[PDB]
Amino acid sequence: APQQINDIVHRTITPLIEQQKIPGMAVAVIYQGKPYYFTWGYADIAKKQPVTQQTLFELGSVSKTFTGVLGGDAIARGEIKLSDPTTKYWPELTAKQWNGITLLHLATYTAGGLPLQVPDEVKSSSDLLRFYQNWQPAWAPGTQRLYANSSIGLFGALAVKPSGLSFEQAMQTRVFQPLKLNHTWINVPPAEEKNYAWGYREGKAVHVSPGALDAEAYGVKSTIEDMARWVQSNLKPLDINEKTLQQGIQLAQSRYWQTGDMYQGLGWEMLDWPVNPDSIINGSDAKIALAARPVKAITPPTPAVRASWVHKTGATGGFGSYVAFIPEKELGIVMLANKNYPNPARVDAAWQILNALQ
Ligand SMILES: *[B]([O])([O])[C]([N]C(=O)[C]C1=[C][C]=[C]S1)C1=[C][C]=[C][C]=[C]1
Ligand SMILES: [K+]
Numbered sequence: 001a002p003q004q005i006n007d008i009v010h011r012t013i014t015p016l017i018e019q020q021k022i023p024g025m026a027v028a029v030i031y032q033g034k035p036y037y038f039t040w041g042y043a044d045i046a047k048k049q050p051v052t053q054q055t056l057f058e059l060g061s062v063s064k065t066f067t068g069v070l071g072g073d074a075i076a077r078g079e080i081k082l083s084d085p086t087t088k089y090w091p092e093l094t095a096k097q098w099n100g101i102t103l104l105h106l107a108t109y110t111a112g113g114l115p116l117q118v119p120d121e122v123k124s125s126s127d128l129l130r131f132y133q134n135w136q137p138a139w140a141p142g143t144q145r146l147y148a149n150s151s152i153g154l155f156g157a158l159a160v161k162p163s164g165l166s167f168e169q170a171m172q173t174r175v176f177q178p179l180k181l182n183h184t185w186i187n188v189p190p191a192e193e194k195n196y197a198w199g200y201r202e203g204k205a206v207h208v209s210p211g212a213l214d215a216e217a218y219g220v221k222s223t224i225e226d227m228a229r230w231v232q233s234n235l236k237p238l239d240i241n242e243k244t245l246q247q248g249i250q251l252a253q254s255r256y257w258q259t260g261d262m263y264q265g266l267g268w269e270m271l272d273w274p275v276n277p278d279s280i281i282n283g284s285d286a287k288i289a290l291a292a293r294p295v296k297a298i299t300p301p302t303p304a305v306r307a308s309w310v311h312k313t314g315a316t317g318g319f320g321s322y323v324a325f326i327p328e329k330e331l332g333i334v335m336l337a338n339k340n341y342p343n344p345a346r347v348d349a350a351w352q353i354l355n356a357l358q
């Protein structure tokens with residue numbers, strides 16, 4: 001690798017791993033559009049398996065960027081519209097609080113305070129309908145943002161209904177396969193288990209447990225190579241040959257709502273660049289508090305702005321992920337770890353690397 005990239009990555013990441021006691025980590029830097037890869041430590045401490053470029057990590061909520069792009073692809077195909085009422089795709093949702101809640105609201109966490117998590121007791125399709133029917137919004141639609149797996153999760157499930165495919169099949173056929181993400185999975189096949197890192201929580205090896213709307217909200221596993229390819233695809237959507245997928249990516253980085261310095265896309269979140277990491281932390285879900293924030297509608301949404309810091313954090317019980325990129329600089333980073341360590345530390349490291357290289 002170019003020595004400047006080698007140096008800033010190692011000089012940043014080695015102390016981060018020490019500070020945070022991270023067992024294993026993989027990083028990719030995308031510079032002038034080429035990926036450069038770095039690995040440290042262990043995918044499996046007990047079996048002494050190193051992190052490699054082929055190691056699978058749980059992306060956690062970075063999965064929402066795939067969900068948002070898959071939804072964008074469905075809009076581009078003319079299967080759904082973000083202006084559609086939720087009830088067009090789920091007419092069984094007859095409770096009157098749903099009147100006025102659109103797919104846009106679900107996708108962007110603005111439906112009125114859908115909860116963060118779907119309860120563990122929701123096990124069946126019947127259970128899931130009961131949950132949404134019984135939910136009482138705190139706020140009118142389109143007035144406050146409250147980050148929520150139950151919101152964008154439901155968006156993903158509904159978005160694929162016109163296709164006639166399961167969510168997983170749709171993601172595979174319409175996003176993973178066209179982009180050559182051949183080691184990216186909603187369900188890790190047995191053949192790939194040799195690559196699947198363990199997550200570590202309180203020093204115990206753990207993997208994400210099944211849950212309602214898991215695929216849609218937090219269920220993707222991927223390698224550093226495929227994640228670098230995902231960043232490249234999102235940096236340069238005009239190089240994508242499949243027209244609806246190119247359009248979908250563009251829709252997911254459109255700016256739909258503003259809160260403070262932050263703009264909400266479909267899965268992706270964005271700020272204007274230049275921006276400093278304290279302002280990114282407070283302008284994002286990377287902060288340690290669960291924040292209800294009033295939002296301003298961007299009427300109509302601003303198309304994807306090249307001068308942006310585009311990012312997403314993710315976690316599972318045992319993993320912590322971060323992706324950020326700046327389109328007008330052809331520059332991005334992926335950080336995958338098998339420990340859920342504090343978000344500000346992720347952003348700090350990412351910014352330190354990208355600002356050195358831009
Ligand atoms: B995401 O913001 O990373 C999301 N992830 C998950 O819900 C997956 C997890 C399973 C167990 C622990 S995290 C998230 C939302 C709200 C709280 C934490 C993580
Ligand atoms: K599920």
